[PDB]
Design a protein around this nucleic acid. Structure first.
Ligand code: GTP
Lengths: 77, 98, 73, 847, 272, 74, 84
RNA sequence: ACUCUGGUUUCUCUUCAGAUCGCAUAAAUCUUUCGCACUAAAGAUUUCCGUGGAGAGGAACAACUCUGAGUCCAAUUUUUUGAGGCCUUGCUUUGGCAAGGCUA
């Protein structure tokens, strides 16, 4: 059985282009390279970029720290 | 928690060195504080006491709210009231105009 | 928490976060504020009564409650 | 509903609404060896669901031994149903239908009548004694009837307070008991999913006297409740077997840290229990309050003044609480009526599970066709009218509703035994008091009034004007055979009808009582032993007929057999003298009569499989092996009928017109037998030349059947006839010193000792021996008197063996009132049974 | 007023050891099988005598063993005799072995054997695998050790500082199997004359080898034991009226506290 | 004292998940924790636009978990 | 002092037919299979009604406790041992 | 965791007690039975040896052990927020309500 924490650690080791969903913000999606996590689900993305659904404008945010209380679902690629 | 000690005084350290120390400036110097509410309202007053939850009590608070007609800012005066910390968006001390 | 024990078995009306009104015999409550009301009826506004029975409403959904009728026999 | 009742923890409306949810119902039977603690299991349970019903300090109120003879005799004599709402470990409530069965080896028919209507079994196993005669017998019976088995190792205080074993050796004793049970289960069952282990929740540990009852999960939940942070379900998986606690790393390993380290069960479960008991019984004045403070138990000062046994009961009650390990065990491992309705129909319904009614019943749907099956009949104290007791397998029985009671001989073409009746009232039966209800849905047990007239032993109760093709449930198959035999007659012969009516009433009471009227106008009762027949006569005299009844000396039923093949082939012609049959008789091969009786083989099998069996198992050629015609006096009686008539010698097709009559003649003539009108056992009848008359008006009917019977008799008589004695299997538990006295007592009654062996962890011994059933009356009294009460035996029917002598020998001179030497026991047994049956003085050996 | 005693267990053990020369040292009531009150009741009602027990006189004149004719029922030519039907067999099963049984008090059946292993050394553990106990001949969905179950830091077996056995655990278990009053720890006082010290001596089996006078004495003691138990009438309801209190209420009597012997001489002379 | 959610019956089974923002998901469960966060293998987006997008190994926070539906027979 | 009376009423409600209302306005009615300390219920044979009113059948589910707004327990439970 | 009942011992009196009222077990009278009544049984009545329950009075020291009663939690799952803003329709109690579509 794969644990969410183990999966997050594996993704951080791989440093894949993790795309994270938003809580209640369906249109706004954020992709980035996972660097580290915490017990509060706080994630840090090296090369962050916000992707919209109606505008679809990829705006680079750089090194950002997304709170765990707002993330919805972490996807690769 | 790694600090289950009964003599828990770290709450005051955050009130002196952490982000919560800003409210301590308003408590000590008695400076006007403007806080943005989750209901799209702004209240300007003077906070007397608070806690880790951010629930503070303000005295002589002026509340501003915009209602649309077009958005027009309405003002109400309050002598004193208690505001929940979780029901606030941002709290900032009044800037020094001079 | 005797403030709610004195209201046990009383037919009370509860105002929810979504605006729904639940009138029924308040049976028990917990620290989480979960409401256990029996022979409950749902009141919504167009007025309409929707009888439910034993109602287990979560504490988060609890907003305000007031006594509507004395406990029955 | 409107009946005055003792106060309960629950409320009767909750009980009434639990009956409609057949996933919250558990139909359980409690069983075990005698005195292994079942009664107070339910009693201590009735206490916890009945706050005002409290056991007397110095005397246990058995509350399930409700009768009179049970009360002073101190044996369980009848099964008694109990219905209780019992909470679970997680606080959920289930409706338990518990059947409390007796543990005497004589009264096993009550156990089968309780196993029929149950979905699971709880076997009670005294922790000091261990696995005894009835434990093994009930294990066999309960895995045969396809019930889910759990185990309660009761009386575990005896390990602490009597044997005083070190906690580790108590652990070894419990593990040994569990292993014995597992071995028996695997002996009597192919599939492996009946593995019993306290790691599966399958085994419960208890001490009913002191209100102890736990599984591993409930004890781990005691820990979890006190120290809140442990997950009691994963704790429970580390509390048995060779798994040790490593207190430095706080982890459970499979290898003991260093040495002198205790297993997890000893360390975490058994040492605390030893220490509670030792503190209470030894240090009650000195340091009991400190440990009761440690455990969080506070006894009022008027309670620390209690005697040591009530104090121990109260302390253990406070620490443990309710019997939620029992409820956990039964809810997890005993199926609900809904889930266990498929094996029930598969096993006990004559219509097969594939029938449409065998489908509407296998859902346990309480809105379907009514199908209620009653196995017990409980008599109102006035002794006039009975109340049937069974379970509703489908539909719903209502008070006042007219029902159609089907007997045991009812078939779909012979519909004369069914009878319309009118249900009067319906009681949910707790042990002592009946709770009258208005309806009982499917999956529940009900006490019915109004259907008591047309049923003798068991019934299938259905609906009239519907259910047009509703067959019956198979009649109970019992553990034993009824062999002991007494004859009765009223003192004043003017009141014979009163005694006949009383005999009918006792026949209703006892599930395996068999009262018959012999040819001589003599009324006979068949029973299992001395306690059984003593209680039957007690009831007959004092309850059902209030007259004075004489009792004959106890005797046994015999059986007749042969020991070679008939010398000259015998024959018999019809009175027409055109039909001629010819037979010879020889003894069945060793170990085949049991296969025929124990349904290892049936004649319902196709000829191919039957022949294949006989071939591979007893060296039969395909010709004869497929030539079998019938099987014994029954459909499964221990006799065969073979046709060796060659197709060339006799027209096989023409012979087939008298097969159906030769079979009947053989069945009847094996049912009676020529020697003393006893059954024939272990005899093979080969036909040799059946000259058949072509004229159908000359053969068939009342012409050929008696000819078949007479040739059967003659063929049996030309092979050397013998008699047969029922042999009893005696198990005795006696101290090591009184073991030799057991040998001394046995040898005077033709008894032969198979084995004596110690009881592991117990100071006692078990002597197992075989004794003739006739040489057994007073054997229990002889053994318990010669040993000053220190030796005790339960004896049960085992096999049929040949009486030493030769029954057909007139050279033997028998005096009227003295015991014979063995050389001619058979002759006496034959002629005295002839005299008692009313037949002639001696046989007429002829053709 | 001396009407109730509350004792500790080290006192009850000491009183139990001292009395042992007067004590039976059984652990059961299986010794008294077919030799107990109910058995003697039944034997009296059936007009028979258990060998070693009381012999009463016929309860009621009725039919006799030489008064019933031959019938076809009880014909002695239909009867198989293997072992004679003793009278104990008619006491043990009073309804199977007996025509017209009345007043048959059903005897108590078995009682599970007590396997209390009596201790011999005070210098042995209380819980100890005695040599009188037959050995247990030695010979599992457990989870793997690597499974991540950890018992929290402040969790230990329930009573862990409490020692398993104390210096009065062996003695306080032996008190469970003691004869009353030693299986008590509190109770109500009796009068000195209400305590028979040998009533449990002659309720035992008639001893073999003693001369006939002793055995007849045993059975004669048992006869009056059974008659006392059977003819017992409940004490009638009344109003407490005490004679000597009425004596003291009047002015004619007075009180002192004398030696017993002095009052013995007084009573002797007074009666004279 | 966070007892793990009772989800062993749905382990390695095709399940449909409901998103907080009216979203829907699909995939095969692979594990869970006391916070209810689930790891799903062979995840299918199943967006409201009608086009199903396959992702694979994804992690979903328990806060946004709205409801679980076992597509496969359990 | 740990589990409230509503918790016991909800736990004992397993087995009967229960209707749960979620924060998303979806009503699921079915036979409860198991319930935990939290409101997390794993119902079965659920007739699901959407906000617009569409009716759907769901054989197996696991309702998230946080999203459960209010539920209607079976009428039989009104005489439960815990609720008395 | 703060306050208030209830005590125990002893002497006397009144009433009920079929409850092993007593973990003991006497005597008398009457009847019946048979012997032919210490050496014998059954039934009934009585008296004695002496107990429990309740109630009542007296008089001796303990008074709050006990019995009860009144008197440390902001980071998913409940109480320290995804909250607030835009559009249409029916009715507007012209305040807006109801549903849906949205933006955050
Ligand atoms: N030592 C000990 N004795 C017990 C225990 N439970 C019951 N007994 C006693 O053992 C005997 C068993 O009697 P019951 O429990 O009525 O017997 P049973 O198991 O119902 O069996 P049957 O007599 O066939 O009905 C009685 O003397 C009980 O008091 C126990 O846990 N420990």
């Amino acid at each position: 059985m794969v644990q969410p924490i183990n999966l997050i650690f594996r993704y951080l080791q791989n440093r894949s282009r993790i795309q994270v969903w938003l809580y209640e913000q369906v249109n706004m999606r954020i992709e980035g390279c996972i660097i580290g996590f915490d017990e509060y689900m706080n994630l840090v993305l090296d090369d962050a970029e916000e992707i919209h659904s109606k505008t679809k404008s990829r705006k680079q945010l750089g090194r950002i720290m997304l709170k765990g209380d707002n993330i919805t679902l972490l996807q690769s690629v | 928690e790694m600090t289950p000690e009964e003599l828990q005084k770290r709450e005051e350290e955050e009130f002196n060195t952490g982000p919560l120390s800003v409210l301590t400036q308003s408590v000590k110097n008695n400076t006007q504080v403007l806080i943005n509410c989750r209901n799209n309202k702004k209240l300007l007053g003077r906070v007397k006491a608070f806690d880790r939850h951010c629930n503070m009590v303000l005295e002589n608070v002026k509340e501003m709210w915009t209602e649309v007609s077009k958005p027009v800012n309405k003002d109400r005066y309050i002598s004193k009231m208690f505001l929940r910390g979780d029901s606030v968006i941002v709290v900032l001390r009044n800037p020094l105009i001079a | 928490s005797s403030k709610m024990l004195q209201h046990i078995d009383y037919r009370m009306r509860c105002i929810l976060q979504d605006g729904r009104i639940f009138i029924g015999t308040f049976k028990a409550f917990d620290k989480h504020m979960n409401l256990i009301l029996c022979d409950c009826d749902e009141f919504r506004k167009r007025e309409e009564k929707r009888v439910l029975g034993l109602v287990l409403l979560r504490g988060e959904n609890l907003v305000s409650m007031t006594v509507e009728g004395p406990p029955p026999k | 509903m409107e009946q005055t009742l003792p106060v309960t923890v629950y409320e009767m409306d909750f009980l009434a609404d639990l009956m409609d949810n057949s996933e919250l119902i558990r139909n359980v039977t409690l069983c075990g060896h005698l005195h292994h603690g079942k009664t107070c299991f339910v009693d201590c349970l009735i206490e916890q669901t009945h706050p005002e019903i409290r056991k007397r300090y110095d005397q246990d109120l058995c509350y399930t031994d409700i009768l009179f003879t049970e009360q002073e005799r101190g044996v369980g004599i009848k099964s008694t149903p109990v219905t209780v709402v019992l909470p679970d470990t997680k606080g959920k409530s289930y409706l338990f239908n518990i059947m409390d069965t007796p543990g005497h080896v004589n009264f096993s028919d009550e156990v089968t009548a309780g196993l029929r209507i149950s979905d699971g079994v709880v076997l009670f196993i005294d922790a000091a004694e261990g696995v005894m005669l009835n434990t093994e017998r009930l294990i066999k019976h309960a895995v045969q009837e396809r019930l889910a088995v759990t185990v309660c190792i009761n009386k575990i205080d005896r390990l602490i307070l009597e044997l005083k074993l070190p906690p580790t050796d108590a652990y070894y004793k419990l593990r040994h008991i569990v292993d014995e049970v597992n071995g028996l289960i695997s002996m009597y069952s192919t599939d492996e999913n009946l593995i019993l282990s306290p790691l599966l929740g399958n085994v419960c540990f208890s001490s009913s006297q002191y209100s102890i009852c736990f599984t591993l999960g409930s004890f781990a939940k005691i820990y979890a409740d006190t120290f809140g942070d442990i997950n009691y379900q994963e704790f429970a998986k580390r509390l048995w077997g060779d798994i040790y606690f490593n207190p430095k790393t706080r982890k459970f390993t499979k290898k003991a840290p260093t040495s002198s380290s205790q297993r997890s069960f000893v360390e975490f479960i058994l040492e605390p229990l030893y220490k509670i008991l030792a503190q209470v019984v030894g240090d009650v004045d000195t340091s009991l309050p400190r440990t009761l403070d440690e455990l969080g138990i506070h006894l009022t000062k008027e309670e620390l003044k209690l005697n040591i046994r009530p104090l121990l009961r109260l302390v253990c009650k406070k620490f443990f609480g309710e019997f939620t390990g029992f409820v956990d065990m039964c809810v997890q491992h005993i199926p609900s009526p809904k889930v266990g309705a498929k094996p029930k129909i598969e096993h006990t319904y004559t219509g097969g599970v594939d029938s449409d009614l065998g489908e509407a019943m296998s859902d346990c749907d309480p809105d379907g066709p009514l199908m209620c099956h009653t196995t017990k009949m409980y008599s109102t104290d006035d002794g006039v009218q009975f109340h049937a007791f069974g379970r509703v397998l489908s539909g719903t029985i209502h008070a006042g509703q007219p029902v159609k009671v089907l007997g045991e001989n009812y078939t779909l073409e012979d519909e004369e035994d069914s009878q319309i009746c009118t249900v009067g009232r319906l009681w949910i039966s707790v042990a002592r008091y009946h709770i009258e209800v208005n309806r009982v849905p499917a999956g529940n047990w009900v006490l019915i009034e109004g259907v008591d007239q047309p049923i003798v032993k068991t019934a299938t109760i259905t609906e009239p004007r519907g259910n047009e093709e509703a067959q019956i449930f198979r009649p109970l198959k019992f553990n034993t055979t009824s062999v002991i035999k007494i004859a009765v007659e009223p003192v004043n012969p003017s009141e014979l009808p009163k005694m006949l009516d009383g005999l009918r009433k006792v026949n209703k009471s006892y599930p395996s009582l068999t009262t018959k009227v012999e040819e001589s106008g003599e009324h006979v009762i068949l029973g299992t032993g001395e306690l059984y027949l003593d209680c039957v006569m007690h009831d007959l005299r004092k309850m059902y007929s209030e007259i004075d009844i004489k009792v004959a000396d106890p005797v046994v039923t015999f059986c007749e057999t042969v020991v070679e093949t008939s010398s000259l082939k015998c024959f018999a012609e019809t009175p027409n003298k055109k039909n001629k049959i010819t037979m010879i008789a020889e003894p069945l091969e060793k170990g085949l009569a049991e296969d025929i009786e124990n349904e290892v083989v049936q004649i319902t099998w196709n000829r191919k499989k039957l022949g294949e069996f006989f071939q591979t198992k007893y060296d039969w050629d395909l010709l004869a092996a497929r030539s079998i015609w019938a099987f014994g006096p029954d459909a499964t009686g221990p006799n065969i009928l073979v046709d060796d008539t060659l197709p060339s010698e006799v027209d096989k097709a023409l012979l087939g017109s008298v097969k159906d009559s030769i079979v009947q003649g053989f069945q009847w003539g094996t049912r009676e037998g020529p020697l003393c009108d006893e059954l024939i056992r272990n005899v093979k009848f080969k036909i040799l030349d059946a000259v058949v008359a072509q004229e159908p008006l000359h053969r068939g009917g009342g012409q050929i059947i008696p000819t078949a019977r007479r040739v059967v008799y003659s063929a049996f008589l030309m092979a050397t006839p013998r008699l047969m004695e029922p042999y009893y299997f005696v198990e005795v538990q006696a101290p090591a010193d009184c073991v030799s006295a057991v040998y001394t007592v046995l040898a005077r009654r033709r008894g032969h000792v198979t084995q004596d062996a110690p009881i592991p962890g117990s100071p006692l011994y078990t002597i197992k021996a075989f004794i003739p059933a006739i040489d057994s009356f007073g054997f229990e009294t002889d053994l318990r008197t010669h040993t000053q009460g220190q030796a005790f035996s339960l004896s049960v029917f085992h096999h049929w063996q040949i009486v030493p002598g030769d029954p057909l020998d007139k050279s033997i001179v028998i005096r009227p009132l003295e015991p014979q030497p063995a050389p001619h026991l058979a002759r006496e047994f034959m002629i005295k049974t002839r005299r008692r049956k009313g037949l002639s003085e001696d046989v007429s050996i002829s053709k | 007023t001396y009407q109730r005693w509350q004792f500790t267990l080290p006192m009850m053990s000491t009183l139990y050891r001292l009395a042992n020369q007067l004590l039976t040292d059984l652990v059961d009531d299986n010794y008294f099988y077919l030799f107990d009150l109910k058995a003697f009741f039944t034997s009296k009602a059936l007009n028979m005598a258990i060998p070693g027990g009381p012999k009463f006189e016929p309860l009621v004149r009725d039919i006799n063993l030489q008064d019933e004719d031959w019938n076809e029922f009880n014909d002695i030519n239909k009867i198989i005799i293997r072992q004679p039907i003793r009278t104990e067999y008619k006491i043990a099963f009073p309804y199977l072995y007996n025509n017209l049984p009345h007043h048959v008090h059903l005897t108590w059946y078995h009682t599970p054997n007590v396997v209390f292993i009596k201790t011999e050394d005070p210098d042995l553990p209380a819980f100890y695998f005695d040599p009188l106990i037959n050995p247990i001949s030695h010979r599992e969905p457990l989870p793997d050790d690597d499974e991540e179950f950890e018992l929290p830091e402040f969790v230990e077996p329930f009573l862990k500082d409490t020692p398993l056995y104390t210096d009065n655990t062996a003695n306080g278990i032996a008190l469970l199997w003691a004869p009353r009053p030693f299986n008590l720890r509190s109770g109500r006082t009796r009068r000195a004359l209400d305590i028979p010290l040998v009533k449990n001596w002659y309720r035992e089996h008639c001893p073999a080898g003693q001369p006939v006078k002793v055995r007849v004495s045993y059975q004669k003691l048992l006869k009056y034991y059974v008659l006392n138990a059977l003819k017992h009438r409940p004490p009638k309801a009344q109003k407490k009226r005490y004679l000597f209190r009425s004596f003291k209420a009047t002015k004619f009597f007075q009180s002192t506290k004398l030696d017993w012997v002095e009052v013995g001489l007084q009573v002797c002379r007074q009666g004279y | 004292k966070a007892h793990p959610p009772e989800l062993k019956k749905f382990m390695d089974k095709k399940l449909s998940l409901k998103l907080n923002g009216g979203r829907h998901v699909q995939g095969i469960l692979r594990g869970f924790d006391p916070f209810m966060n689930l790891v799903i293998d062979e995840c299918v987006e199943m967006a409201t636009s009608g086009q199903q997008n396959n992702i694979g190994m994804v992690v979903i926070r328990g806060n946004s978990i709205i409801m679980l539906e076992a597509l496969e027979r359990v | 002092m740990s589990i409230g009376v509503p918790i016991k009423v909800l736990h004992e409600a397993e087995g009967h037919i229960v209707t749960c209302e979620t924060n998303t306005g979806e009503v699921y009615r079915g036979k409860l299979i198991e319930a935990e300390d939290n409101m997390n219920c794993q119902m079965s044979n659920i007739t699901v009604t959407y906000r617009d009113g569409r009716v759907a059948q769901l054989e197996q589910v696991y309702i998230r406790g946080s999203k459960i707004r209010f539920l209607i327990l079976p009428d039989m439970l009104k005489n439960a041992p815990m609720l008395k």
